[PDB]
Scaffold this motif. Structure first.
Motif, PDB file in Angstrom:
ATOM      1  N   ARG A   1       4.878   6.901  -4.757  1.00 14.04           N
ATOM      2  CA  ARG A   1       3.989   7.522  -3.786  1.00 14.04           C
ATOM      3  C   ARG A   1       2.692   8.008  -4.420  1.00 14.04           C
ATOM      4  NH1 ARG A   1       3.922   4.364  -1.311  1.00 14.04           N
ATOM      5  NH2 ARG A   1       5.920   3.467  -1.993  1.00 14.04           N
ATOM      6  N   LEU A   2       2.637   8.076  -5.755  1.00 13.12           N
ATOM      7  CA  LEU A   2       1.391   8.342  -6.459  1.00 13.12           C
ATOM      8  C   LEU A   2       0.333   7.304  -6.132  1.00 13.12           C
ATOM      9  CD1 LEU A   2       2.829   9.515  -9.827  1.00 13.12           C
ATOM     10  CD2 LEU A   2       1.289  10.851  -8.336  1.00 13.12           C
ATOM     11  N   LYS A   3       0.740   6.150  -5.615  1.00 11.54           N
ATOM     12  CA  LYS A   3      -0.231   5.154  -5.209  1.00 11.54           C
ATOM     13  C   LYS A   3      -1.196   5.721  -4.174  1.00 11.54           C
ATOM     14  CE  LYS A   3      -0.460   0.382  -3.765  1.00 11.54           C
ATOM     15  NZ  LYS A   3      -0.099  -0.854  -4.480  1.00 11.54           N
ATOM     16  N   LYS A   4      -0.759   6.725  -3.400  1.00  8.39           N
ATOM     17  CA  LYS A   4      -1.601   7.360  -2.382  1.00  8.39           C
ATOM     18  C   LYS A   4      -2.828   8.060  -2.966  1.00  8.39           C
ATOM     19  CE  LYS A   4       2.366   8.882   0.121  1.00  8.39           C
ATOM     20  NZ  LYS A   4       3.003  10.183   0.553  1.00  8.39           N
ATOM     21  N   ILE A   5      -2.748   8.518  -4.219  1.00  6.26           N
ATOM     22  CA  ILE A   5      -3.881   9.248  -4.783  1.00  6.26           C
ATOM     23  C   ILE A   5      -4.994   8.315  -5.245  1.00  6.26           C
ATOM     24  CG2 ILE A   5      -2.075  10.864  -5.502  1.00  6.26           C
ATOM     25  CD1 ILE A   5      -3.096  10.216  -8.436  1.00  6.26           C
ATOM     26  N   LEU A   6      -4.742   7.008  -5.295  1.00  6.75           N
ATOM     27  CA  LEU A   6      -5.622   6.013  -5.873  1.00  6.75           C
ATOM     28  C   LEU A   6      -6.492   5.371  -4.802  1.00  6.75           C
ATOM     29  CD1 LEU A   6      -4.947   6.213  -8.839  1.00  6.75           C
ATOM     30  CD2 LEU A   6      -2.972   4.825  -8.287  1.00  6.75           C
ATOM     31  N   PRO A   7      -7.696   4.901  -5.166  1.00  3.33           N
ATOM     32  CA  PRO A   7      -8.551   4.130  -4.258  1.00  3.33           C
ATOM     33  C   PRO A   7      -8.080   2.691  -4.105  1.00  3.33           C
ATOM     34  CG  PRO A   7      -9.608   4.306  -6.391  1.00  3.33           C
ATOM     35  CD  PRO A   7      -8.345   5.129  -6.470  1.00  3.33           C
TER      36      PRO A   7
END
Lengths: 167, 161
Positions: free
Chosen positions: A161-167
């Motif tokens: 879910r850290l993918k959410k912090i990325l552009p």
RNA sequence: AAAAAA
């Protein structure tokens, strides 16, 4: 959405070999490497230019050619893990080959696979280290490329879910 | 306590360089490697004979020399078994994953991540010393580079006997 | 099979 993530070092031939780790092939192949001038994509360009249905990308750790200390490594690992999250597909775990690079590069990609998940983590050993596509194709006819499966990793949904912090 | 876990391949000299990752060195050194002939214990045995109050041991993956198959149905389990028995019981070990094929370095990283390590690190040497005084020359001239890759807390897998 | 797949 078969996606192969590969670390590369100064032997670009691990990546075409990795591509043949499964007979179906891969829909996407993404490579992470240092930006050392010794890194050479020529064999990678020609090989994947011959597979126009494959999404292929080279990603460098900008400005860092050689990991020699802690700062270097923590930078390498931060940019690697951002790359992993970015390139790993959404509805499916990636395949990851950790063959290329110095030991710290392989170990950091192993650790990323343990955190974010991977359908398989593998390494490729070649009897004679093919220097070229044609010798790779020779070698896999003779069975002189050995694929080492070192394990499925589920990862952790909360870490994906850290993918959410990325552009 | 103050325990270095080191994977070895065919370049035994990663281990004494590892020992010099800190001025104090280590009170124990434990090496894990495959069972191939091209592993030479002699520089390791000679080195640690000169340090009698370091406890030193070498453990091989009996029966397995090369790893070519699915971590050849064997390496990982012996590695993880070895890590638990060699690791200190009330403190975390220091881990050098320098030696071996990539799969054995990667597997030690994974063991560190599961069981805990005070430090995980890798060692680069400009000219790859083959003996002790070459390494002491490299150490003098800044020719050995220690790469700290990070503390690992591990789990409650340590609790395994 | 440590500065880069056995």
């Amino acid at each position: 959405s078969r996606v192969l993530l590969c670390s590369a070092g100064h032997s670009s031939m691990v990546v075409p070999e990795a591509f043949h780790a499964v007979p179906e092939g891969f829909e996407e192949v993404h490579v992470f490497t240092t930006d050392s001038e010794k890194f050479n994509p020529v064999v990678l360009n020609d090989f994947f230019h011959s597979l126009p249905n494959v999404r292929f990308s080279i990603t460098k750790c900008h400005g860092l050619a050689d990991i020699l200390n802690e700062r270097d490594f923590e930078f390498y690992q931060e940019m690697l893990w951002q790359w992993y999250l970015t390139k790993m597909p959404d509805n499916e775990l990636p395949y990851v080959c950790l063959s290329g690079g110095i030991k710290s590069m392989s170990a950091s990609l192993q650790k990323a696979a343990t955190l974010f998940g991977a359908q398989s983590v593998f390494h490729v050993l070649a009897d004679n280290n093919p220097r070229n596509i044609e010798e790779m194709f020779d070698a896999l006819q003779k069975g002189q490329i050995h694929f080492i499966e070192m394990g499925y990793e589920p990862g952790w949904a909360a870490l994906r879910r850290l993918k959410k912090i990325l552009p």
